[PDB]
Amino acid sequence: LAYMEGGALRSMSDKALGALRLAVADNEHLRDALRLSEDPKRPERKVQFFIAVYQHLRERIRQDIIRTDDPVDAIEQMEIELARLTEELTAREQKLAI
Amino acid sequence: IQSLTARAPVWLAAQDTLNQLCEQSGETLASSNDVTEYMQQLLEREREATVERDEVAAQKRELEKQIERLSQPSGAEDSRMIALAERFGGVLLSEIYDDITIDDAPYFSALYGPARHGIVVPDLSLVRPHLETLEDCPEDLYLIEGDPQSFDDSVFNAEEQTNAVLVKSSDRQWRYSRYPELPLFGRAARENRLEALNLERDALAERYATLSFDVQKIQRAHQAFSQFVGKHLSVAFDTDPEAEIRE
Amino acid sequence: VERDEVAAQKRELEKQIERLSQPSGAEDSRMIALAERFGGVLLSEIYDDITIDDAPYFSALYGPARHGIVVPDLSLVRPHLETLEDCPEDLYLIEGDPQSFDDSVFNAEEQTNAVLVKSSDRQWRYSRYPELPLFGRAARENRLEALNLERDALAERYATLSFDVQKIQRAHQAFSQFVGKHLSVAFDTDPEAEIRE
Amino acid sequence: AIRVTQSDRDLFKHLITEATSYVSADYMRHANERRTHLDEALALRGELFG
Numbered sequence: 046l047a048y049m050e051g052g053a054l055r056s057m058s059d060k061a062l063g064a065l066r067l068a069v070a071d072n073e074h075l076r077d078a079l080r081l082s083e084d085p086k087r088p089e090r091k092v093q094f095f096i097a098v099y100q101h102l103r104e105r106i107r108q109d110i111i112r113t114d115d116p117v118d119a120i121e122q123m124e125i126e127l128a129r130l131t132e133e134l135t136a137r138e139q140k141l142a143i
Numbered sequence: 144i145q146s147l148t149a150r151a152p153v154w155l156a157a158q159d160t161l162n163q164l165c166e167q168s169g170e171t172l173a174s175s176n177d178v179t180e181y182m183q184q185l186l187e188r189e190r191e192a193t194v195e196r197d198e199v200a201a202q203k204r205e206l207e208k209q210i211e212r213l214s215q216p217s218g219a220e221d222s223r224m225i226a227l228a229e230r231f232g233g234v235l236l237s238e239i240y241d242d243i244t245i246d247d248a249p250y251f252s253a254l255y256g257p258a259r260h261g262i263v264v265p266d267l268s269l270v271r272p273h274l275e276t277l278e279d280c281p282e283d284l285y286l287i288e289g290d291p292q293s294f295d296d297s298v299f300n301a302e303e304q305t306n307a308v309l310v311k312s313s314d315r316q317w318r319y320s321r322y323p324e325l326p327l328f329g330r331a332a333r334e335n336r337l338e339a340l341n342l343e344r345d346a347l348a349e350r351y352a353t354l355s356f357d358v359q360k361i362q363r364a365h366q367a368f369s370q371f372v373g374k375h376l377s378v379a380f381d382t383d384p385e386a387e388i389r390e
Numbered sequence: 391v392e393r394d395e396v397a398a399q400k401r402e403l404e405k406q407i408e409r410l411s412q413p414s415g416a417e418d419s420r421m422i423a424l425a426e427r428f429g430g431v432l433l434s435e436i437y438d439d440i441t442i443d444d445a446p447y448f449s450a451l452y453g454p455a456r457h458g459i460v461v462p463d464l465s466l467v468r469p470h471l472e473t474l475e476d477c478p479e480d481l482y483l484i485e486g487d488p489q490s491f492d493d494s495v496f497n498a499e500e501q502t503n504a505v506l507v508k509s510s511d512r513q514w515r516y517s518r519y520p521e522l523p524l525f526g527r528a529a530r531e532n533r534l535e536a537l538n539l540e541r542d543a544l545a546e547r548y549a550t551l552s553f554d555v556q557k558i559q560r561a562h563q564a565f566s567q568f569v570g571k572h573l574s575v576a577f578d579t580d581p582e583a584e585i586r587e
Numbered sequence: 588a589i590r591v592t593q594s595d596r597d598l599f600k601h602l603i604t605e606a607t608s609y610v611s612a613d614y615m616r617h618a619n620e621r622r623t624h625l626d627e628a629l630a631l632r633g634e635l636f637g
Contacts (some may be wrong), residue, residue, distance in 0.1 A: 046615040048152045054616045061609035068602050088617055099610045100600065118597055121363070123596040129352075129361045130589045143216070143225055175566055190394050197398075256480060257454050258513070267514055274516065275501055282520060283453050288512035298511050305472050312510060314495045315485035316455070317464070319471065323479060376569055 075101060144388060152385040157375050164371055168364070174380055182368060189361045196354040203351055206344040212325050213337045218239055219260045220281050227280060231273070233264035234291040237375050240328040252326030253308045254301060256318060261285025263294055393551035400544040407537050414529040421457060424477060427470070430461035431488040436527035445526025449499055450505045450517040456524040458482030460491055 046054065062083075069075045078094040102116040110126070113119045165172045172178050211333050215221055217238040228235045237260050243251060252259060264270060277284070289295055300311035307321045325336050409416055417434070425432050434457060437448060449456060457478075461467060464485050474481070486492055497508035505520045524535065568576075 046612065047619070048148070048155075051616055054619075055606050058612045059615070060610060061605050061612065064601075064605045068605055082637055088613070091610050091613055095606055098602070098606045102589070104605070105595075108594075112596065115597055116603060120596065120600055120603075125356060125359045125363065126592050127589065127596070128363070129355050130592070132355065132359075134589070141222060143221070157506075175570055179562070179566060191391075193394075194398075250439045266513070274506065277516065278518075280516075280518070282518050284516040286514045286516070297513070307471075307474075309471060316495065317467075318455075319474070319477070319481040319483070321477070321479045336584070373493075377573065 072101070147384045151388070154378045154381055154384055157378045160371060162377065164367060167367075170276065178368065178372065182365070185307050185361060185365050185368070189358065189365070192354060192358045192361060196351065197357055199347060199351045199354060203344065203347045206347060207341060210337055210340045210344065213333055213340075217245075218327075218333065224260065224262075225279055227277075227284070228262055231262065231264050231270055233262040233286075236261050236263055236287065236294075237327060237330065239263065239291070239294055241330050244330040245332050246324045248329035248332075249275075249322045249324065250308070251328045253320040253322050254299065254310070255328075256320050257283065258285040258287070261287050263287045263289055263291045264288060265279065281321055377388060393548055393555060393564070396544055396548040396551060400541060400548060403537060407534065407541065410534055410537075414534050415527065418457075418478070418575060420476065421478070424474075424481075425459045428459060428461050428466050429463060430459045433458045433460055434524050434527070435482065436460060436488065436491050438527045440526040442526050442528065445523035446519045446521060447500075447505070448525040449523030450519050451496060451507065451518050452494075453507075454480065455482045455484070458484050460484050460486050460488045478485075482512055484514060493520070503585040515572055 055139075065079060069079055075097055076097070080096045082094045083088045084090070099116065103114060106114070106116065106119060110118055111122050113122060168181075170181060172181060214216060216225065217235060217331070219235065219237050223279070224235060236255070236258070262285070264286055265288055267286060270286065287294075287297055289297065302309040302383060307319060310318050312318055325333070327333070411417075412419075417432075421432055433452070433455075440448060459482075461483055462485055464483070466551045467483060484492065484494060499506045504516065507517075509515045522530065
C-alpha cells in the first residue's frame with residue numbers, strides 16, 4: 046500500500062468499516078472497541094480493536110480438532126478438513142440384510 | 144525513477160506472496176529452477192503417503208469384513224442361510240450350539256468341521272423336491288437329520304485324540320481335525336473376540352485419518368504452488384526496487 | 391498420478407501370478423511331504439489331467455476333500471496320527487489304489503449345475519458347479535496366460551503414461567527457460583519503427 | 588461435520604479479512620502522512636536556510 050494515494054486508502058478503509066458494522070453487529074465488546082476506534086486523533090485504538098478481534102477468535106478455535114493458535118493459520122486446517130470429509134463421504138454400498 | 148516506480152508495487156506483492164509461501168514450507172526458495180525441483184519433491188511425497196494410506200485402508204476393510212462375519216444372528220454365512228433355514232422345517236446348527244462353553248467350543252468346532260454351519264432337518268426327503276430350485280446358496284450346503292429341539296449327537300465314527308479328533312466320514316474316507324483357537328460355536332464369548340476386533344479396528348481408523356489428512360495437505364500445497372506460478376513468475380526473484388530508487 | 395495407479399495394479403497382477411508358484415498355480419508342498427510319509431498320492435495329482443469340461447463337475451463332487459491323500463492301507467496313519475502336528479488343520483484321507491483309483495464312495499446324484507451327495511447316515515451334502523476346479527488342472531496355463539494378457543495390458547498402459555509424463559516435463563522445462571531468459575522482452579513491439587523515428 | 592466446519596470457516600475468513608484491511612489501511616495512511624510531513628519540513632527548511 047505504500048505506493049498509493051490517500052484517497053484510495055480512505056475508500057478501502059470506509060468500505061471495510063461498512064462491512065465490519067454488519068459483521069460485528071451482535072457482539073458487544075468488539076462493537077464498543079470499533080466505536081472507540083473511529084476518532085482519527087487516537088490511532089492506537091484501532092490496533093487495540095485488532096487485538097480484541099484476534100483474542101476473541103482464539104477462544105473460539107475449538108482445539109479438539111485444531112492446534113494452531115493463530116486463526117489465519119487455522120483457515121488452512123479448516124480447508125483440509127473440508128476436503129478430507131468430502132472424500133470420506135463417497136460410498137460403501139455393501140447393503141444386504143434380513 | 145518513473146520506470147522503477149511503475150514496476151515497484153507488482154514486485155512487492157509478488158515478494159509478499161513468495162515469502163508467505165516458502166515460510167509455509169520448511170525449505171526456502173531462491174530461483175525458478177529451485178521452485179521446480181521443490182515441485183518434484185512434493186510429488187514424491189504425495190506418491191509415498193498415498194501408498195501407506197491405501198495399505199492401511201486395505202487392512203481396515205479386512206477388519207470390518209472379519210467383524211461383520213461374526214455379527215448376526217448367530218454369526219455365520221448369513222447372506223442366504225437365514226432364509227434357507229426357514230424355507231425348510233429346520234434350524235441352523237450353529238444356533239443350536241449358541242450356548243456352549245468356551246472349553247467345549249474348540250472340541251465341537253473340530254468335531255463338526257466344515258458342517259458346523261449346516262442346517263438340521265429331520266427328514267431330508269422333503270428337501271429333495273425343493274433342491275433343484277437352489278440356485279442361490281453357498282457353494283457347499285450341509286444338511287443334517289435329527290430333532291431340532293433335542294438334537295442327538297450326529298452319528299459320527301468320531302475318535303478323540305490329543306488336541307485333535309479323527310472321524311470316518313464314509314467307507315474309505317477319514318477326516319482329521321486339529322483343535323482350533325477362538326472357534327465358531329459358543330457364540331457367547333465370540334462376542335468377546337469381536338470386542339477385541341473392535342478395539343483393534345479403532346487404531347486403524349485413527350491412523351487412516353491422520354494419513355488422509357497428510358495427503359490432503361500435500362495436495363493443497365501443490366495447488367498453492369501452481370496458483371503462485373500462474374500468477375507470479377512475471378516478476379519473481381527480481382532485484383529490489385526500494386534500494387535502487389533510494390540510490 | 392495415473393501412471394502410479396497403473397503401476398500399483400500391475401503389482402497386484404504380478405503378485406497374483408507369483409501366487410501361481412508351482413507348477414502353474416501353487417500347490418502346498420507340505421501336503422507332498424505328508425503324501426511321502428504315508429504310502430499314497432495326492433488326489434489332485436491323480437486327477438490333474440482330467441478334461442476341463444468335466445473338471446467343474448468333479449470339483450463339485452469332492453468338495454472340501456479335493457485336497458487329500460489316497461492311502462490304500464489306512465493302517466500306517468492311525469499309529470502316526472498322534473504324531474501329526476504341522477499338518478493342515480483339516481486333513482483328508484481316502485483309501486484306494488493310487489495307480490488305478492476306483493470311484494470314491496459317493497452316493498452322488500447329478501442336478502442342474504449341481505451335485506448332491508449322501509455323505510453319511512443322516513447327512514447329505516449339496517454343491518454347485520464352480521470354475522477353476524482343483525481337478526483337470528492341465529496346469530490351467532490358459533488362466534496364467536489370461537493373467538499375463540492383463541498384466542501386459544497394464545504394462546503397456548503404464549508405458550504410454552510414462553512417455554506422456556516425460557513429454558509434459560520437457561515442455562515445462564522449455565517454458566521455465568524461456569521465462570528465465572526472454573520474459574523481460576516478451577510481447578513487446580518492434581523497435582525498428584522507433585529507431586526510424 | 589461438514590456443515591459445522593463450513594459455518595466456522597466462513598465466519599473466520601470474512602471477519603478476519605475485514606478487520607485486517609480496516610486496520611492496516613489506516614496504519615499505512617499514517618505512515619504516508621508522516622513521510623509527507625518530513626518531506627515538507629526538509630523542503631521548507633532547505634529553502635529557508637538558503
